[PDB]
Design a protein around this ligand. Sequence first.
Ligand code: A1D82
Length: 280
Amino acid sequence: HQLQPRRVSFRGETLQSPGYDPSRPESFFQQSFQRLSRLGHGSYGEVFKVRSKEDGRLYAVKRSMSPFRGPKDRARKLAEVGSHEKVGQHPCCVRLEQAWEEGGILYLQTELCGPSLQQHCEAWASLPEAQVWGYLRDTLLALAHLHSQGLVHLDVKPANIFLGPRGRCKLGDFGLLVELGAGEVQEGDPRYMAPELLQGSYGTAADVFSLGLTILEVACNMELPHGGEGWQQLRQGYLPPEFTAGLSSELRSVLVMMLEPDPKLRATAEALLALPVLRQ
Ligand SMILES: Cc1ccc(O)c(C)c1-c1cc(-c2ccnc(N3CCOCC3)c2)cc(C(N)=O)c1N
């Protein structure tokens, strides 16, 4: 026999939902959602576009790949939900609707978003810069929100930022969020990593640096180095001309503020948002 689905939350039960019958053998996920498409799959699991039977609206649902192997494995996976709950509701962050576990599998149901910035770039040669400014501003708003909550995203990158309506950006994938102890956290993508993280040092500034390289990459449509001399030369306090062909003086000026190697000299999200060029 199989235990009933249980809600996963770190705030304050078995899952009951209109349309869900525990008497029937299919999973909560099978009974309570219509699977429309698969949006992604990897070792992290699978992500589906679904329609909810409870309210008729569209959502995304992520489910892990294999059953929990032991109590610590379970605890580490469930921690994503606690982190996401700390982020809560914000128009530039992917909103978690509910999470549950059934059959040793973890499900996160969120609002449905569009393609990642990685995907949008790939299927776009370069993005119009007005689009890029929108993505920069919206993800800065997300970072100001995270920092307001004493949170740092240690894996800001094009794959973790999702398009929304009319040019809007939402930051997601909060499994590598840390609170300002740190908690367990996995290896972020070296391409976008702030230099201080090599010495294990982190803070609000690290995700500003990663957003800087994220936006640089999408604006120039060139792969950033994962190590070696080219990695070092993006972390010196200048923009290598290799990456700035086409980029306006205005965008360059803001990126260099974000890419300052000394996290004490690096701009904050709120200071960037207060720049005339990022108004509204
Ligand atoms: C379901 C969910 C739960 C928590 C969460 O934080 C998020 C973002 C999502 C969520 C994830 C994805 C998605 C699609 C394909 N690949 C990835 N990847 C992950 C990072 O590595 C690359 C591959 C992610 C798409 C959407 C969507 N469009 O609505 C979505 N909401």
